[PDB]
Amino acid sequence: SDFVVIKALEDGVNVIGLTRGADTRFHHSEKLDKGEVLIAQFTEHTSAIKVRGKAYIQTRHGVIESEGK
Amino acid sequence: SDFVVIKALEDGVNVIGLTRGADTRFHHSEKLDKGEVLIAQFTEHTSAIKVRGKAYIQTRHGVIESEGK
Amino acid sequence: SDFVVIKALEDGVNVIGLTRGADTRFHHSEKLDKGEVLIAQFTEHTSAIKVRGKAYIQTRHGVIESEG
Amino acid sequence: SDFVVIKALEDGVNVIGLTRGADTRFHHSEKLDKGEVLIAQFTEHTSAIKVRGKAYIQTRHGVIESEGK
Amino acid sequence: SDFVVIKALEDGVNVIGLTRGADTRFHHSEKLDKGEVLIAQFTEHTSAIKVRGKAYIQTRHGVIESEG
Amino acid sequence: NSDFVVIKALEDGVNVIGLTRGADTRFHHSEKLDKGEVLIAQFTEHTSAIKVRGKAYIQTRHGVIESEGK
Amino acid sequence: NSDFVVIKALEDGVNVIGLTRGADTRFHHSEKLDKGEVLIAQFTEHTSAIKVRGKAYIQTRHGVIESEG
Amino acid sequence: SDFVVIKALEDGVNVIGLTRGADTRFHHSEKLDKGEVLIAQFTEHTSAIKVRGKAYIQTRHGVIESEGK
Amino acid sequence: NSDFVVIKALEDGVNVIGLTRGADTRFHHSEKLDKGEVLIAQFTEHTSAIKVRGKAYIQTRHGVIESEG
Amino acid sequence: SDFVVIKALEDGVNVIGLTRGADTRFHHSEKLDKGEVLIAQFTEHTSAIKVRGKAYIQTRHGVIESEG
Amino acid sequence: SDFVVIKALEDGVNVIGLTRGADTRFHHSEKLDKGEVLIAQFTEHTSAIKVRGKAYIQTRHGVIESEGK
Ligand SMILES: N[C@@H](Cc1c[nH]c2ccccc12)C(=O)O
Ligand SMILES: N[C@@H](Cc1c[nH]c2ccccc12)C(=O)O
Ligand SMILES: N[C@@H](Cc1c[nH]c2ccccc12)C(=O)O
Ligand SMILES: N[C@@H](Cc1c[nH]c2ccccc12)C(=O)O
Ligand SMILES: N[C@@H](Cc1c[nH]c2ccccc12)C(=O)O
Ligand SMILES: N[C@@H](Cc1c[nH]c2ccccc12)C(=O)O
Ligand SMILES: N[C@@H](Cc1c[nH]c2ccccc12)C(=O)O
Ligand SMILES: N[C@@H](Cc1c[nH]c2ccccc12)C(=O)O
Ligand SMILES: N[C@@H](Cc1c[nH]c2ccccc12)C(=O)O
Ligand SMILES: N[C@@H](Cc1c[nH]c2ccccc12)C(=O)O
Ligand SMILES: N[C@@H](Cc1c[nH]c2ccccc12)C(=O)O
Ligand SMILES: N[C@@H](Cc1c[nH]c2ccccc12)C(=O)O
């Protein structure tokens, strides 16, 4: 299973997991403060991940940055 | 299982999931506001994804950009 | 499973799914307007995909363009 | 499963599927008009694909071009 | 399964499939006229393929040309 | 089997935190690292996300990233 | 499923010979190739070694090799 | 199944195995002296490895060096 | 779907010798090749080691090696 | 299964196998003399290998040298 | 399953197979004379291979030479 690396570039960045299955909703929100790193998998319960705030992102396809505000 | 990365380049980008199976319709529309990133898999319920609006997309195959009206 | 990427370079592009199995026919036609992107897999029900209209297409084998 | 991309370079190109199994015959002819693209897999029912007419073909082994009469 | 691509460089090219199993013979010959392309798999029934005639051949090992 | 991450602690008191796999998300273990220790940690049946706090040098299949403390 | 060998006959009468898989080893088939003909042949339940006699150009996973008459 | 190489740059290096499962504890500590190498797998019982002391370390992602107290 | 070895005989009377898989080790089959013939031989249920006597050009997954008379 | 190459650069190099499982123990020590090569796998019984003495070592991750 | 290529650079080279399992001992010693090539797999019975004497060795990891007494 693939994972995504997320480095928070400011306080209060949110890594949100959406539910796998016929229903789509947020099941969890992980708050990252500046400089913190989260390495997060796709799992049985999480089939999509949303990032809100300024962060540097690595995936198998390369780097992308989310932008706050 | 494969996933796409979607960075909204403007407000109100829509990431639309089409059902796996004999029938084809939309089962969920994730809206993204400017700067937000979504990392989204193909799953048991989603076998085709559609993007409406200005966004920067990465897939196994490289980058593509969606353009809004 | 493999997928194709389709960006509509014009209004009214169709992505057509043909049926998997001993019979071959159209079961669904996804309309795309200019600028819209569809990412679409091969599936239990779709074993061939047809693009009609002006689109930029990426597959595992590279880029190919359909023309109006 | 592998697949092949076929761009029709002229009207009336045919992508023919030959049946898998002990017997070999044509089971379906998809007609393409100039500019239309087909992406078609090898399947339980098709284990060989014939292209008739001028078209641009990509497969895992590269680009090949069919020509008409 | 792997597959072979055959472009007919003249009329009357032959793509011949040999039977898989303890015994060996031709089970189907597919005629290819000049310019026609066949993409053919190895399968439950075909474990070798012979090409007779002038053709352009691609496999996973590269290109090879048959001569008439 | 599954992927792993390399974490070198660039100061004392670095925290490598495992998040629970499954429908609920909580911290189950926090492995503390002092300066210069290396931890090589996998994703597992119990761990489906890892969070790093403090200044550390990180390697994954996607390349290096560095965490920074406050 | 299963490596294959490409054999181009560089003269008439080239022989591609299959050896039997199993505890016992013998020739079970000899496929005659005349000048310019190409044979693409798999390893199989029945054939676990292939011998080429006569002048031919051979491609395998490992490269080209040439047999001499 | 993945493995790490550990070369001890000083006496007393410490390769610590952590238990796989819902509980996390060290279950084995293999000490290395200067110049000794260990090649260790991830296993049914070890899902994380900790290195203490000055060592040179190769994993699939590259070399990393641990530095001691 | 195992590895195979390409052997080209550079002189008459080269010998490709197959050793038995199992607790017991000895030769079960000796294929003689004369100058210029090529043998392409797999590892199999019955052969888990191959020995080449004489002058031949050998290709494997790991590159070319030459056996000498 | 992965394996490792050990060429002893001096007499008396030891390649030690640690047991797979909940318990960790040396179960075999192969002595290598100057210039002898061992190619050894991870197995059902051996899930860690320790090299003691001067040797040149190749693994999937590259070359590393143990020193006496 | 992996294999090793061993070319004898002198007479009396020894390719020695160690037993797979809880016990470790020699079960077969295959002698090579100068110029002979042995291509030998890992197997249900052999999980470690030792070479004595001057040989050129190729594995997945490269070329290593054994030096004889
Ligand atoms: N309990 C969650 C933890 C998690 C993994 N990846 C995530 C991404 C976003 C949010 C939560 C998560 C799960 O197993 O799915
Ligand atoms: N519950 C949906 C969530 C989802 C995943 N990928 C998506 C892409 C588009 C829209 C929704 C989704 C699913 O499991 O499939
Ligand atoms: N419901 C369709 C959706 C789909 C996936 N790929 C397609 C390609 C073309 C048309 C429709 C589709 C299916 O699972 O097959
Ligand atoms: N129903 C057919 C459709 C098809 C797939 N690939 C093809 C190639 C050529 C012609 C038809 C097809 C099938 O599953 O096989
Ligand atoms: N019915 C044949 C079709 C075929 C596939 N590949 C071929 C190559 C040559 C001749 C026929 C074929 C089969 O499944 O095997
Ligand atoms: N050996 C039989 C049956 C057979 C085995 N494999 C085949 C592939 C194709 C056609 C027939 C066969 C025959 O030649 O008739
Ligand atoms: N009936 C033979 C056909 C064949 C395949 N590969 C070959 C190589 C040489 C000679 C014959 C063959 C088989 O399935 O094995
Ligand atoms: N017992 C834990 C060990 C572990 C693995 N990865 C981790 C990451 C962080 C913290 C602990 C761990 C587990 O199997 O999951
Ligand atoms: N019947 C033998 C044929 C063979 C394959 N590879 C070989 C190498 C050497 C000698 C004989 C063989 C087998 O299946 O094993
Ligand atoms: N008995 C331990 C041996 C081991 C493998 N890798 C390790 C890493 C650290 C400590 C011990 C080990 C096991 O199978 O897990
Ligand atoms: N009988 C041992 C032999 C062995 C394999 N790899 C080793 C590494 C070191 C020492 C012994 C071994 C085993 O199968 O595990
Ligand atoms: N019968 C032995 C032959 C063998 C294979 N690899 C070897 C390496 C060394 C010595 C003998 C062998 C076996 O299956 O294991």
Residues in chain H after which the backbone breaks (C–N beyond 2.5 Å): none
> For residue H41, how far is its CA from the centre of ligand 8 (angstroms)?
15
Local structure of I10: helix, strand or coil: coil
Q: Which uninterrupted H or E stretch holds G15?
A: strand G14-20
Closest listed residue to residue B28, CA positions, set C45, I56, E40, A18: A18
Q: Residue G1 is encoded by which pair of tokens?
A: 């499923």
> How far is the C-alpha of A58 from the C-alpha of A52, rounded, in Å?
15
What residues of chain E have any CB closer than 8 angstroms to a CB in chain G? Answer: 1-2, 4, 18, 20-22, 24, 42, 47-52, 54-55, 57, 59, 61-62, 64-68
> For residue B54, how far is its CA from the centre of ligand 1 (angstroms)?
28
DSSP secondary-structure letter at F11? S
> How far is the C-alpha of A60 from the C-alpha of D48, rounded, in Å?
33
> How far is the C-alpha of A37 from the C-alpha of A19, rounded, in Å?
22
> How far is the C-alpha of F65 from the C-alpha of F47, rounded, in Å?
20
> How far is the C-alpha of D50 from the C-alpha of D30, rounded, in Å?
11
Closest listed residue to residue I36, CA positions, set K40, G15, G19: G15
> How far is the C-alpha of B60 from the C-alpha of C3, rounded, in Å?
9
Confirm if E14 and E29 have CB atoms less than 8 A apart.
yes
Chains that touch G (3 or more CB pairs under 8 A): E, I
DSSP secondary-structure letter at I66? E
> How far is the C-alpha of F28 from the C-alpha of F26, rounded, in Å?
6
Q: CB atoms < 10 A from the CB of A64, how many?
A: 21
> What's the reported resolution, in angstroms, to a tenth?
2.5
Please judge whether A5 and F51 are an interchain contact, meaning their C-beta atoms are less than 8 angstroms apart.
no
CA angle G32, G36, G42 (to 5 degrees): 55
Q: Confirm or reject: Cβ of A38 under 6 Å from ligand 2.
A: no
Confirm if J9 and J34 have CB atoms less than 8 A apart.
yes
Nearest bound ligand to the CA of residue E17: 5
β-strand C3-8 against C37-41: which pairing, if any?
Answer: antiparallel
> For residue E47, how far is its CA from the centre of ligand 7 (angstroms)?
6
Q: Give the closest residue (by CA) to ligand 8 atom 8.
A: F18
State the total domains in chain K. Answer: 1
Confirm if G55 and G11 have CB atoms less than 8 A apart.
yes
Name the residue among J28, J34, J59 with its Cβ closest to that of K24.
J28
> How far is the C-alpha of G56 from the C-alpha of E21, rounded, in Å?
25
Q: In what order do the strands lie in the sheet with I63-67?
A: G27-33, G14-20, G47-53, I38-42, I4-9, I56-60, I63-67
What residues of chain H have any CB closer than 8 angstroms to a CB in chain J? Answer: 1, 3, 5, 7, 17, 27-28, 30, 32, 34-41, 43-45, 56, 58-60
DSSP secondary-structure letter at G21? P
Q: Which uninterrupted H or E stretch holds I7?
A: strand I4-9
Q: Say which residues have a Cβ less than 8 Å from residue I62's Cβ, sequence separation at least 6.
A: K5, K58, K59, K60
Q: Give the closest residue (by CA) to ligand 4 atom 10.
A: D17
Q: In what order do the strands lie in the sheet with K62-66?
A: I27-33, I14-20, I47-53, K37-41, K3-8, K55-59, K62-66
Q: What is the DSSP string of D25-68?
A: -EEEEEEE-TT-EEEEE--SSEEEEEEESSEEEEETTEEEEE--
Report the residue of F8, F52, F62 to disrupt the A interface, i.e. the one with the largest count of A CBs within 10 Å.
F62
**Which residues' Cβ are closer than 6 Å to ligand 8?**
F 16, 18, 29, 31, 41-42, 44, 46-47, 50; H 18-21, 24, 47-48
CA atoms F14, F19, F25, F28: torsion sign: negative
> How far is the C-alpha of A10 from the C-alpha of G36, rounded, in Å?
68
Closest listed residue to residue J17, CA positions, set K65, K47, F40: K47
> For residue I24, how far is its CA from the centre of ligand 12 (angstroms)?
8
Q: What is the DSSP string of J6-56?
A: EEESSTTEEEEEEEPSSS--EEEEEEE-TT-EEEEE--SSEEEEEEESSEE
Tell me phi and psi for residue G11, to 5 degrees. -165, 175
Instruction: State which ligand 6 atom lies nearest to the alpha carbon of E23.
Output: 1
Q: Residue E44 is encoded by which pair of tokens?
A: 């439950």
Location of structure tokens 């499982």: J21
Tell me the residue type at H18: L
Report the residue of B16, B33, B37, B64 to disrupt the A interface, i.e. the one with the largest count of A CBs within 10 Å.
B37
Tell me if there are at least 3 CB pairs under 8 Å linking chains G and E: yes
> For residue J47, how far is its CA from the centre of ligand 10 (angstroms)?
6
Confirm if H25 and H48 have CB atoms less than 8 A apart.
no
> How far is the C-alpha of I56 from the C-alpha of I36, rounded, in Å?
9
Please judge whether C66 and D35 are an interchain contact, meaning their C-beta atoms are less than 8 angstroms apart.
yes
Burial-class residue B43 by CB neighbours within 10 Å (0-12, 13-18, 19+). Answer: middle
Helix H, strand E, coil C: the string for chain C is CCEEEEEECCCCEEEEEEECCCCCCEEEEEEECCCCEEEEECCCCEEEEEEECCEEEEECCEEEEECC
Residue count of chain J, please give it. 68
Confirm if E41 and D48 have CB atoms less than 8 A apart.
yes
- J32 chain-K contacts, CB cut-off 8 A: 50
Q: Confirm or reject: Cβ of I31 under 6 Å from ligand 9.
A: yes
Q: How was this structure determined?
A: X-ray
Closest listed residue to residue B50, CA positions, set E40, J23, C37, A66: C37
CA atoms A50, A54, A57, A62: torsion sign: positive
Task: Give me the domain span that covers residue C63.
Answer: 1-68
Confirm if I31 and G51 have CB atoms less than 8 A apart.
yes
Report the residue of G27, G39, G65 to disrupt the I interface, i.e. the one with the largest count of I CBs within 10 Å.
G65
B44 Ramachandran zone, left/alpha/beta (phi>0; psi -120 to 50): alpha
β-strand I38-42 against G47-53: which pairing, if any?
Answer: antiparallel
**What Cα–Cα distance (Å) separates residue H64 from each residue in E34, H29, I17?**
60, 20, 46
Confirm if A57 and A64 have CB atoms less than 8 A apart.
yes
> How far is the C-alpha of A53 from the C-alpha of A68, rounded, in Å?
4
Find residue E8's DSSP bridge partners: E55
Confirm if A43 and F21 have CB atoms less than 8 A apart.
yes
Closest listed residue to residue C63, CA positions, set E34, A7, D39, G13: D39
Location of structure tokens 């600028």: C35
Closest listed residue to residue I69, CA positions, set I49, I51, I55: I55
Chains C, D: CB contacts within 8 A come to 67
Helix H, strand E, coil C: the string for I23-65 is CCCCEEEEEEECCCCEEEEECCCCEEEEEEECCEEEEECCEEE
Closest listed residue to residue D68, CA positions, set D11, D6, D3, D5: D11
Confirm if E52 and E28 have CB atoms less than 8 A apart.
no
Find residue B26's DSSP bridge partners: B18
Nearest bound ligand to the CA of residue D21: 5
Local structure of A34: helix, strand or coil: coil
Torsion of CA K52, K53, K55, K61, to 10 degrees: 40
> How far is the C-alpha of E7 from the C-alpha of D57, rounded, in Å?
11
Confirm if D59 and D65 have CB atoms less than 8 A apart.
no
- J51 chain-H contacts, CB cut-off 8 A: 36-39
Closest listed residue to residue I16, CA positions, set J39, G55, G19, K17: G19
> How far is the C-alpha of F61 from the C-alpha of F3, rounded, in Å?
8
Q: Which uninterrupted H or E stretch holds J63?
A: strand J62-66
Q: What is the DSSP string of chain K?
A: --EEEEEESSTTEEEEEEEPSSS--EEEEEEE-TT-EEEEE--SSEEEEEEESSEEEEETTEEEEE---
Residue count of chain E, please give it. 68
Q: Which uninterrupted H or E stretch holds G19?
A: strand G14-20
Burial-class residue C56 by CB neighbours within 10 Å (0-12, 13-18, 19+). Answer: middle
Tell me phi and psi for residue C25, to 5 degrees. -155, 180
Q: Residue F25 is encoded by which pair of tokens?
A: 């998300």
Q: Say which residues have a Cβ less than 8 Å from residue I42's Cβ, sequence separation at least 6.
A: G43, G48, G49, I2, I3, I4
CATH number for the domain harbouring residue C50: 2.60.40.50
Chains that touch A (3 or more CB pairs under 8 A): B, F
Q: Say which residues have a Cβ less than 8 Å from residue F58's Cβ, sequence separation at least 6.
A: A5, A37, A39, F5, F6, F7, F8, F52, F64, F65, F66, F67
CA distance J26 to chain K (A): 12
> How far is the C-alpha of D57 from the C-alpha of H9, rounded, in Å?
57
- State which of C14, C19, C41, C42 you would mutate to test the pocket of ligand 3, scoring each by most atoms of that ligand within 8 A of its C-beta: C41
Closest listed residue to residue K8, CA positions, set K34, K39, K29: K34
Tell me the residue type at B9: L
> For residue H13, how far is its CA from the centre of ligand 12 (angstroms)?
37
> How far is the C-alpha of K58 from the C-alpha of I60, rounded, in Å?
10
**What Cα–Cα distance (Å) separates residue F39 from each residue in A13, E30, F56, H5, H57?**
26, 61, 11, 13, 11
> How far is the C-alpha of H67 from the C-alpha of D63, rounded, in Å?
53
Name the residue among C40, C45, C58 with its Cβ closest to that of B21.
C45
Q: Say which residues have a Cβ less than 8 Å from residue F55's Cβ, sequence separation at least 6.
A: A35, F9, F10, F11, F14, F66, F67, F68, F69
The per-residue b/e assignment along A35-63, b for 16 or more CB within 10 angstroms, e otherwise, is bbbbbbbbbebbbbbbbbbbbebbbebee
Q: Confirm or reject: Cβ of F21 under 6 Å from ligand 1.
A: yes
Q: Say which residues have a Cβ less than 8 Å from residue B23's Cβ, sequence separation at least 6.
A: none
Q: Say which residues have a Cβ less than 8 Å from residue K63's Cβ, sequence separation at least 6.
A: K56, K57
